[PDB]
Design a protein around this ligand. Structure first.
Ligand SMILES: NC(=O)C1=CN([C@@H]2O[C@H](COP(=O)(O)OP(=O)(O)OC[C@H]3O[C@@H](n4cnc5c(N)ncnc54)[C@H](OP(=O)(O)O)[C@@H]3O)[C@@H](O)[C@H]2O)C=CC1
Ligand SMILES: COc1ccccc1/C(=C/c1coc2nc(N)nc(N)c12)C1CC1
Length: 186
């Protein structure tokens, strides 16, 4: 298996969701960037794996489930099998990463992408080893009820450039945002 990564878009007040949707209006090209980053695999004959919590899975409209061209794994202790449209179910992040090493996936998975929500990001961000965060800073406050965990900059280094990531300020629907990549290795 290849690298472990988290990807998120977050407002200035650290918001990532409100009432199971976006705190902000849809940002079409920001979403395109999410699709591109999570779908594109460096390794021939492999797909990337996305790992998400149960609330995040059900926040994807029923017609957009699963995220196409990626292997979709949901984290839940309540569910007894993968939800309709999902491919895998694990009871913990540790278990999901272990699964990625089993016969069924060990040869099929390139990058792994944690795509929410707050508790899955927090566990991933605190997991020892090499990990990158791809963070879109939406540069306005938006009312939220779910928040991105603290990024400890003693460990996470903001990279000065990254291939395939635009470095200038973006704007859609009057909302400015910018892309960042952070890397730790501990
Ligand atoms: N980039 C962005 O702005 C993103 C925004 N979002 C937003 O965030 C919100 C949803 O996120 P959030 O509320 O945090 O919820 P989660 O997706 O993380 O879902 C929480 C549920 O998933 C399960 N879960 C989470 N972590 C684990 C774990 N380690 N092991 C097993 N099960 C786990 C639990 O389910 P159970 O009870 O079944 O055990 C828990 O109740 C929405 O607003 C959505 O729009 C989501 C992703 C990205
Ligand atoms: C309601 O949100 C969606 C609806 C349909 C399909 C995918 C999504 C998702 C989006 C983003 C997750 O991390 C993200 N990170 C970035 N920078 N942007 C995003 N847009 C997501 C998350 C998985 C539920």
């Amino acid at each position: 298996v290849g690298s472990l990564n988290c990807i998120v878009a977050v407002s200035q007040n650290m918001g990532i969701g409100k009432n199971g949707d976006l705190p902000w209006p849809p940002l079409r090209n920001e979403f395109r960037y999410f699709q591109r980053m999570t779908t594109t695999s460096s390794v021939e004959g492999k797909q990337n794996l996305v790992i998400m919590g149960k609330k995040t899975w059900f926040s994807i409209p029923e017609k957009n489930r699963p995220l196409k061209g990626r292997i979709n794994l949901v984290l839940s202790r309540e569910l007894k099998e993968p939800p309709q449209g999902a491919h895998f179910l694990s009871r913990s992040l540790d278990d999901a990463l272990k699964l990625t090493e089993q016969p069924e996936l060990a040869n099929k998975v390139d990058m792994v992408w944690i795509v929410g929500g707050s508790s899955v990001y927090k566990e991933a961000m605190n997991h020892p080893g090499h990990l990158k965060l791809f963070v879109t800073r939406i540069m306005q406050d938006f009312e939220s009820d779910t928040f991105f965990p603290e990024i400890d900059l003693e460990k996470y280094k903001l990279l000065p450039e990254y291939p395939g990531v635009l470095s200038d300020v973006q704007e859609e629907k009057g909302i400015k945002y910018k892309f960042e990549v952070y890397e730790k290795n501990d």
